[PDB]
């Protein structure tokens, strides 16, 4: 029946690719899938900034796939409500922000998950080690800052701490 | 090389057994291990009977161990949910090159974050969530712990007399 | 450092997608990747439309690639069950320091070992078996592939017209 | 219902400990377990050299746990027969012998398994790397040779190939 599965890791770890692998796998067995994306960064897709913007539309689907779950403030209630109604809920997210603080409600969701898979990146500094962290490479304080390789890199533990 | 590995799941999932599997594996390669346990959980000792590269300590605060961890290659912290200084302690060790391994419940009986376990996740190179077998329906994996006695507080020491592991359907029933 | 990683499972499990996730991850760290595909499986190309550190080759024997693999950090072999020289090729590369990653069916439609996949297992640093969703009962994970047309031979190219992924109960029914 | 789960890896990887963790987990949910061991190296234990020596006794148990599965010549038929009758079958074994050849029927079982978990040891030569292989440290040819750390060590790939 219902469950919540979490796919976490740093940036550049292919978390969305693993989410969509799980989605495609379900589509092959003719189960219907609703993919929800973050608007500011047998298949339907929606882009929103709050999960309430989707209303009741999720009820018609067997599987819900939430991408970049760190940005949704109502994630926990939304996922449990769906999983309680028998949906397979899958979330892709960063567990940590650039300071390794809990990003959004991701760490809060952990106790509700039937499964949690932490994916690694490859360290983009030493090229020699798995990366579990994200370092911000530009001097901006704010937690939410949208960007890719131009402003963030994945790092191992030794390279995260190099300099500051 | 320094790292933190987290072993989580509900009660009855064999988390300590997995922690000690990782410890025995390191001992075979002659790396030294420091096992730290929570002194107030006395179930094992009060109803059960008694290596060269292994040390064991039982404490209620991780500061009670001071610097002794520095002499060991590997630190293995059991029932990590009960230690308030877990995050700072694990990072300080991992940054000094220790392999830190923690066994803990991620969730309490209400599925609220237990201690600093959920806070540690962003610091971990690895996170393995283990399942139990649901002790109500017997036919589903269990990811949650239900408290079977009517006590509100979060810390309450006990085993199968006071808790059972459950699937999602049986947690809410 | 050299290694072999094996990605197995039944059909419809997204094995190639996981292989390419591992490839894209390496490309982000500017390590170069050589993707090798089986030339006779033309399903993707015959019904579908068309990076700097990536190369792709389509062959029926791994010798058709000669030495070209030596210039790459990572080798990604897709549908490995069809290559007869897989074991020797993967070890030679891994021993020369390549990260070798193979996606393959471990079992054919009779659950017999497909090609040299089962033979490779003892050489692998890692083995991940992926599940599909059972295409018969829709409510169980699938670990097997059933052939839905009456053909005996082992190699028979096709997709969902000719095969479905099944749980254990639905494989035998 | 029925399934076959395989726990493989080199020596010194704690494979039997992971097998027994799965057994203990089942016992907590009052499911009954039959542990079968290799005689030459809610719970019952048997030590045998052939799985036929157990006859029909396995039928009374919910869960079967076969240790050192590499030594049983009838493993595949035995596991499928049980899993087909609705047993949870769990096997702990070496997938490779000291030359990295398939040990017994372990590699043959893979296509029948719902799950396969390969555990690592820590390399007992360089102490610095995970070990996936077993090296024999005494000059004996024969495949079956019972022993522990006195005659075998776990190694990474680089240390397996050191010298010969
Ligand atoms: C550290 C930090 C980050 N962020 C911001 C910066 C970023 O804008 C975003 C990353 O958040 P995420 O890591 O959850 O987002 P994803 O991009 O989903 O993470 P991935 O691991 O998926 O990224 P990769 O770079 O590995 O993805 P890759 O596959 O290499 O890149 C292709 C791009 O296309 C998308 N994509 C990939 N496969 C797709 C598919 N099958 N269908 C649809 N879209 C797909 C991906 O989302 C990615 O952006 O959040 C902050 O605001 N604060 C912070 O402190
Ligand atoms: C849900 C909830 C629980 N609790 C309390 C209740 C308990 O006092 C404690 C459990 O915390 P845990 O689940 O982190 O503790 P463990 O017992 O470590 O978890 P396990 O997953 O290991 O438990 P099992 O019951 O599966 O362990 P098992 O092997 O069955 O039992 C034997 C006991 O012996 C120890 N043990 C087992 N194998 C061992 C080995 N190889 N070496 C040394 N010791 C070993 C284990 O610690 C276990 O408690 O926390 C709360 O206070 N509030 C709550 O909301
Ligand atoms: C059981 C059996 C099968 N076969 C034959 C039938 C087939 O011809 C082939 C399947 O062999 P595979 O299962 O190893 O082949 P894949 O297609 O590689 O397995 P997947 O698990 O990847 O299949 P999916 O169906 O889940 O893949 P999907 O994503 O759904 O489909 C899209 C196709 O595009 C490719 N693709 C998917 N993502 C891609 C990406 N990111 N980049 C490049 N290519 C990508 C994939 O190869 C897939 O075939 O072998 C036999 O000959 N005998 C037998 O007994
Ligand atoms: C490479 C090679 C090996 N062998 C032989 C040599 C050996 O005699 C045997 C190892 O075969 P295995 O690796 O399947 O056997 P296990 O010992 O089951 O492997 P483990 O990974 O479990 O061993 P470890 O050394 O990590 O186990 P450890 O936990 O450190 O050691 C304690 C011992 O007690 C047993 N044990 C451990 N936990 C137990 C529990 N909970 N209940 C009962 N017994 C338990 C274990 O089997 C081990 O022998 O096979 C060959 O004949 N030919 C070869 O080419
Ligand atoms: Zn690095
Ligand atoms: Zn249940
Ligand atoms: Zn089915
Ligand atoms: Zn080594």
Numbering used by the authors:
A (entry chain B), D (entry chain B): 3 to 43, 59 to 181
B (entry chain A), C (entry chain A): 3 to 52, 57 to 179
The authors write:
Thymidine kinase (TK) catalyses the transfer of the γ-phosphate of ATP to 2’-deoxythymidine (dThd) forming thymidine monophosphate (dTMP). L. major Type II TK (LmTK) has been previously shown to be important for infectivity of the parasite and therefore has potential as a drug target for anti-leishmanial therapy. The enzymes from Leishmania spp. are type II TKs with a ~100 amino acid C-terminal extension compared to those from other species. The overall structure of the LmTK catalytic domain in all three complexes shows a nearly identical fold to those of type II TKs from other species, as expected from the sequence identity of ~50% on the amino acid level.
Ap5dT was also a strong inhibitor of LmTK with an IC50 value of 1.1 μM. In the LmTK-AP5dT complex there are two chains in the AU, both with well-defined density for the dThd moiety and the five phosphates. The coordination of dThd is essentially identical to that in the LmTK-dTTP complex, with E85 in the inactive conformation. Only chain A exhibits good density for the adenosine, which is much less well ordered in Chain B. However, in Chain A, the adenosine is flipped by about 180° from the position expected from the CaTK and TmTK complexes, and lies on the surface of α/β-domain, partially covered by the poorly ordered 42–59 loop. In LmTK-AP5dT, the phosphates have different positions from those in the LmTK-dTTP and the TmTK-dThd-AppNHp complexes. The binding site for adenine expected from the CaTK and TmTK structures is again blocked by the adjacent dimer, just as in the LmTK-dThd complex. LmTK forms closed tetramers in all three complexes, which explains the lack of density for the adenine in LmTK-dThd and its unexpected position in LmTK-AP5dT. While hTK1 has the residues interacting with the ribose ring (D58) and the transition state (R60), these residues are disordered in most of the LmTK structures hinting at a more relaxed binding or might be a crystallographic artefact. However, it is ordered in the structure of LmTK:AP5dT with the side chain conformations of D58 and R60 being identical to hTK1. The LmTK-dThd and LmTK-AP5dT crystals contain two protomers per asymmetric unit, with the tetramer sitting on a crystallographic 2-fold axis, while the LmTK-dTTP asymmetric unit contains two tetramers.
